[PDB]
Nucleic acid binder design. Structure first.
Lengths: 799, 799
DNA sequence: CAACGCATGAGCTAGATCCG
DNA sequence: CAACGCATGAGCTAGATCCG
């Protein structure tokens, strides 16, 4: 037979060898097999136990913390395939922290459908590299076999298997010292094979009896049907867990077995696409008689039979199933004890609930203020009741002030009784208008819901306050609202301004409860104003707040305060919030004005936007000034040690950019650059303070040097006067001429004529002149640097 | 007469000149006279009033924001002296933005006691350079008269006063065009004077009618007594404001005038060393009848008779003017109807009171978790009783959780009845506890304290719980306590465990009236234990907690929990709080290791205490490493552009300090400095990671330059070889020799010899040396900088 | 009779319908 | 018979007398 044995559910084994005895006649195990934590076991009570008739594995096998095993092949001698239907710990088969196992001996395994193997912290195993996972494990890139006895080549590795050359070496792969890993010709990869190499039926695997037969081999691929198995059997039967196809009359009765809410390992199995699947996916709803899934027109419920029909919920873990679980056949109970933030998690998990049939109970609430997370709820059937016939319950909750927004919500109760006791944070108004929309109208207990233990410590109010005038500056906001007096005007404590910035308008609404929050609305108290007894008076109260960054959206309102007294009046008033931004003074200074000059006529200035823009800046205002050189540097003797070498005003309204280039300016001249960041211009023209920077553009290559006829006059005392021309537009200013003369065969003897010396003499002179042929050359050394050399003027003075 | 007028208290004028009329007959002003805020005033209402009787000033005279005064001389024609008792922002007399004032007219000031004059922003004043303040103001170094009408010399400045030459100019000092500044001969600087210049009595000032008489002049220096004044008056009278002396019967009445707490600007005047000082200084306490300040052995009270023997301090302020009060002579009623946070403020405000005489009524508390703020209360006398002879009263307190810790507290009530009603979360044992510790044992009412309306809505558990073996680690503590079972061991819910760290032991008990505060005892619930039906069993339950910090004290206790029931039984049990500190470990890293170099052989290093000590750190472990220079810099041609210029291993157990210097080290080398903060050492020697910094000390003055016999060898080709020696201990390293040779009549031409060139040649050569007398001088330029120059070695090479 | 004048704008003097 | 062994120590496997 393919599988002549019996079905066998997955099961867990710990702390005893007693509960393994339930594997006497099992052949195929659905689920997984976990056996672990086995310390006080003599090793020799394992040699006399085995499970030969067990073949198939669906999910996984695990071995962890065993004291006494040496070779599990004595217990698992015919095991061939792991289906790997579920990945556990991102792995399939794991042997961890073994203490006594010498050799593995899984000599019968052929294929791993899905998953990976992992053997760790086992300093007693050998032949771990004689495995060839690639043949068995279709995916090897995740195999993790480290920190074992094979950390050092010290365990033998001797065995009598073709010794494949899958790697670069002629490695021999064996299971034990008495078992190799059988390999036949690979004409068929995963379709079963014989010892003689003859391939068996394509749709079966493992060891084989007769080739090309899907009925007498061992294990097959797709499904199973009564000694046969085909890729897809005809739909008189429906497929089950990708391993069978059997008639729905059986799994319908399985659905009827634990439809009694007794165990949570069950699933409300449903037929869909000829699959008795646990749940037909989203966008589908259930039917009563035909056991199919209707495509669920709209976001309709699917369904969900509550645990024990009375299950309580205390955390998100106790509400994980609610995703998809929409119609509830039980009584819900909620009690969060502590918690940090669940108001953003319930909607993603239970914001899709519409119908419950039991009764709802709330107690010991700590960190909740509303019931808005209950989005799609519409009705409670109340087939089961609390003691005293209560369809709803609410005791000892000290933080709830809100249930639903009944201007847009609708709930109905079929029957039962309401409970509201010791909920001191919710006014009588809400629960009375709970009764308006709820099914009950006069069904009260007497003593019904507590009328004194609830809402006593928090004074509810249904009164509003409106504003009268608002003025804003860039930094200060002028607030003013209408006056108000309580029915007893002396009974009044003042006003509080709760205010902060709000870049959006999705701001949290005020609830009157103080939790441990770092972020809180800064608030100031306002002295109640003088009583004027005049309707036409200055009784309108207000306040001016000044510590505000400009152009930020601020949410503001004002809340009254009055003492609590015996009479249930003077509830005060509460003003709704409004949004206000500031005014638009001149922005802050422009930041980082960077000036760069690359050529003699180009200067680029780039800045950074002002730190405080004070609104949308319309433009930028730039200004430049042509600086002047020093007049003190004209009268220095520049052949003495020490020489210098440096590197209305027109404007534009530069807009919509961050840099500006200015040309048509004097070359090699200092330029003081200033820019004012400036807001909207035509009304109330005000700009920032100018960020001042200095800039000097590049000099000109020819400006330093001067060309012209350098003439000479020879005096009688052999003192030759020299006449030439100065640079009309030098690079900054001429400071020194590098005048020099040369005899043929004589070096460049240079002389000095100062800027003033050239000015007073209109040239220079060469006293004590040797008779001969001299060439006079002049270099115009500007403060920007030395210029070019003039033409060496030839003149011969003879003996 | 000397001082024939009337005493006149300091007074202020604003927005109306009406109240100035109270200066009709007072000639001496105590305090200060402020005149300010006069906008809508015609200038014509001023020439009809004057004050020819007032002379002296104590604090300061201030004229500010007046619209219409052009000459204040029409109001102050005779006053001459100002004492400046209290500095007005470190000044004495100010005119500050006066708009109508043409001429000041202070033609009568004689002398300045202390302070400064300041005249500002007056574009209508002249003659301000004609004052000669140096003759009247004792301290000129702080005069500030800027930005006035005489910022420009444009107002005339003519006057008919000897034209003093105090400065380098013949400055003519005049007050007005009709009055100059009067100066008589300076034989006596401040001993009074007449028009003819002869000096009057030594102890008086300014004007004078008959000379050399303390009774026949106008104003004197030290004191005053019935038309006379002496340096120290006889002690039948006692000095007042160091300018009079009056009988004790006078200022005892001043003490008794505002012993009635009506105005807070006065003081309870006391006598000390012939001074009716407002308060005898710290460490001195008054006596009742004598009004003398006892030397106050040890701490002494300020004493606080309650206002009208009855007060209802309820809020933050209430009667906040009571800091320092210790004993109260009335009765108090406290009621904080809400509030934000006062727990951290009462101790600094009222946390020093010990005794009250009346009764205490407490009601409507909302944020009062305990009464530990009443730190020093010891006894209640009960002079006034509430209706029904009630001394203690508690009513409708939803957050008064606890009263006191009697193990470290003692309170006694002499008489009266105690009231405690409708406080629904405070149990029955502690009110018995305060009953037994207090005087009363059987003074009850029928009905006395409510036995049901209190502690019913909270699971009060005061019944006994004791712990068992406890175990602790560096991070975790193992807990276990004695088993408890209610009289019905079926009615139960389990345990909850509150904990929080505490650097001290003045921690509030968990005490159970729900106050949602920012800081609260974080709690974990416990599954109630199994029933074993054996007294000798494992019934002791425990718990493991891990999220803790090492070396930190933590308070812990356990509490039972049970379902509510109609029967008043199964009250459960509760444990007392205990302290168990966590264990120490390695400290944190040493912080901010700062190394400073002051000499070549001293290197000081200072650090900061580690952030986490983890126990009492016994010492600090320090180490260092001798860094080496870079060997790659030896083969660099330093004459080319680019030069560099910088600025087991032994140890010691540095203890009980923050810095330590290291001596005995080589000159100018880098050092790697590492220091470990470390806890107790001889057992479990564990220290943290070392804080690593670097340090290089300064070089040696002479180590850079080398001295020695610099001999030379002249070759046949006029190429002279140079022989000299290298510095044995260069500062860091020698890198280049600044070799140079200078012929007479020629410049000191410099040549080059590299570090390796000097190595391969043991010197340098001079190729192309013209015949002459040459002086060779070398400067040893190391990486630490240039050394000294050698001697220019004279050698003569001939033609 | 519906911003500015007749200060400044949160540094021992009061606190923006604050004032007209 | 009163820490350690025949794990680790809060990352889908249990939660420190937790197993002797």
């Amino acid at each position: 037979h393919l599988y002549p044995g019996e079905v066998c559910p997955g099961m867990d084994i710990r702390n005893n060898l007693t509960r393994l005895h339930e594997l006497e006649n099992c052949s195929v195990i659905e689920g997984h097999l976990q056996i672990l934590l086995m310390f006080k076991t003599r090793p020799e009570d394992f040699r006399d136990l085995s499970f030969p008739k067990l073949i198939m594995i669906t999910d996984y096998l695990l071995l962890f913390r065993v004291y006494g095993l040496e070779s599990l092949k004595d217990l698992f001698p015919n095991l061939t395939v792991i289906r790997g239907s579920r990945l556990f710990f991102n792995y399939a088969l794991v042997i961890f922290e073994m203490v006594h196992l010498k050799e593995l001996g899984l000599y019968n395994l052929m294929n791993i459908t899905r998953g990976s193997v992992r053997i760790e912290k086992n300093n007693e195993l050998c032949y771990l590299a004689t495995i060839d996972w690639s043949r068995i494990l279709d995916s090897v890139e995740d195999n993790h076999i480290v920190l074992n006895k094979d950390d050092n080549e010290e365990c033998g590795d001797i065995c009598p298997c073709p010794a494949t050359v899958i790697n670069g070496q002629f490695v021999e792969r064996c299971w034990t010292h008495s078992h190799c890993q059988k390999v036949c010709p690979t004409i068929c990869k995963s379709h079963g094979c014989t010892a003689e190499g003859l391939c068996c039926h394509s749709e079966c695997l493992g060891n084989c009896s007769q080739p090309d037969d899907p009925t007498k081999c061992v294990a097959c691929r797709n499904f199973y049907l009564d000694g046969r198995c085909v890729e897809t059997c005809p739909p008189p039967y429906y497929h089950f867990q990708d391993w069978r196809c059997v008639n729905f009359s059986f799994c319908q009765d399985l659905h009827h077995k634990c439809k009694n809410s007794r165990r949570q390992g069950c699933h409300q199995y449903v037929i869909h696409n000829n699959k008795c699947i646990p749940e037909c996916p989203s966008g589908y709803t259930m039917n009563s008689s035909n056991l199919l899934c209707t495509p669920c027109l709209g976001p309709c419920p699917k369904v969900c039979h509550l645990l024990e029909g009375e299950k309580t919920i205390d955390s998100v873990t106790s509400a994980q199933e609610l995703r998809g679980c929409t119609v509830i056949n039980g009584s819900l109970i909620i009690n969060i004890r502590g918690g940090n933030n669940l108001a953003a998690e319930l909607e993603a998990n239970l914001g899709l609930i519409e119908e419950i049939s039991g009764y709802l109970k709330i107690r010991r609430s700590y960190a909740l203020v509303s019931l808005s997370f209950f989005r799609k709820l519409r009705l409670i059937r109340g087939e089961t009741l609390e003691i005293g016939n209560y369809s709803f319950y609410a005791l000892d909750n000290q933080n709830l002030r809100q249930l639903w927004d009944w201007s847009k919500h609708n709930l109905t109760t079929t029957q039962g009784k309401l409970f509201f006791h010791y909920n001191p944070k919710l006014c009588l108004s809400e629960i009375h208008k709970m009764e308006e929309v709820s099914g009950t109208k006069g069904r009260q207990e007497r003593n019904d819901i507590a009328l004194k233990t609830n809402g006593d410590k928090a004074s509810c109010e249904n009164e509003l306050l409106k504003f009268s005038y608002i003025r804003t500056s860039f930094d200060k906001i002028l607030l003013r609202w209408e006056p108000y007096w309580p029915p007893d005007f002396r009974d009044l404590l003042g006003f509080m301004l709760f205010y902060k910035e709000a870049p959006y308008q999705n701001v949290t609404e005020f609830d009157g409860q103080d939790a441990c929050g770092s972020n809180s609305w800064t608030v100031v108290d306002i002295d109640p104003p003088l009583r004027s007894n005049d309707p036409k008076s200055q009784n309108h109260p207000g306040w001016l707040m000044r510590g505000l960054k400009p152009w930020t959206q601020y949410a503001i309102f004002v809340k009254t305060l009055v003492t609590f007294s015996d009479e249930r009046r003077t509830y005060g008033a509460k003003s709704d919030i409004i949004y206000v931004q500031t005014d638009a003074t001149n922005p802050s200074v422009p930041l980082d004005p960077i000036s760069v000059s690359n050529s003699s006529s180009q200067i680029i200035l780039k800045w950074k936007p002002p730190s405080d823009p004070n609104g949308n800046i319309t433009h930028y205002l730039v200004f430049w000034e042509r600086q002047a050189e020093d007049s003190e540097l004209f009268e220095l003797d520049y052949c003495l040690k020490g020489l210098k070498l440096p590197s209305h005003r027109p404007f534009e309204k530069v807009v919509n950019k961050e840099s500006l280039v200015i040309s048509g300016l004097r070359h090699f001249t200092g330029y003081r650059i200033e820019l004012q960041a400036c807001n909207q211009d035509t009304p109330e023209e005000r700009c920032s303070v100018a960020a001042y920077v200095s800039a000097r553009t590049m000099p000109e290559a020819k400006a330093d040097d001067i060309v012209g006829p350098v003439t000479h006059e020879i005096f009688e005392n052999n003192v030759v006067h020299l006449m030439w021309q100065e640079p009309k537009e030098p690079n900054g200013l001429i400071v020194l001429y590098e005048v020099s003369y040369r005899r043929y065969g004589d070096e460049e003897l240079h002389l000095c004529v100062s800027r003033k010396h050239f000015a007073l003499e209109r040239g220079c002179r060469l006293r004590g002149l040797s008779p001969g042929n001299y060439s006079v050359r002049i270099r115009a050394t500007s403060l920007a640097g030395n210029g070019s050399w003039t033409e060496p003027t030839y003149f011969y003075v003879t003996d």
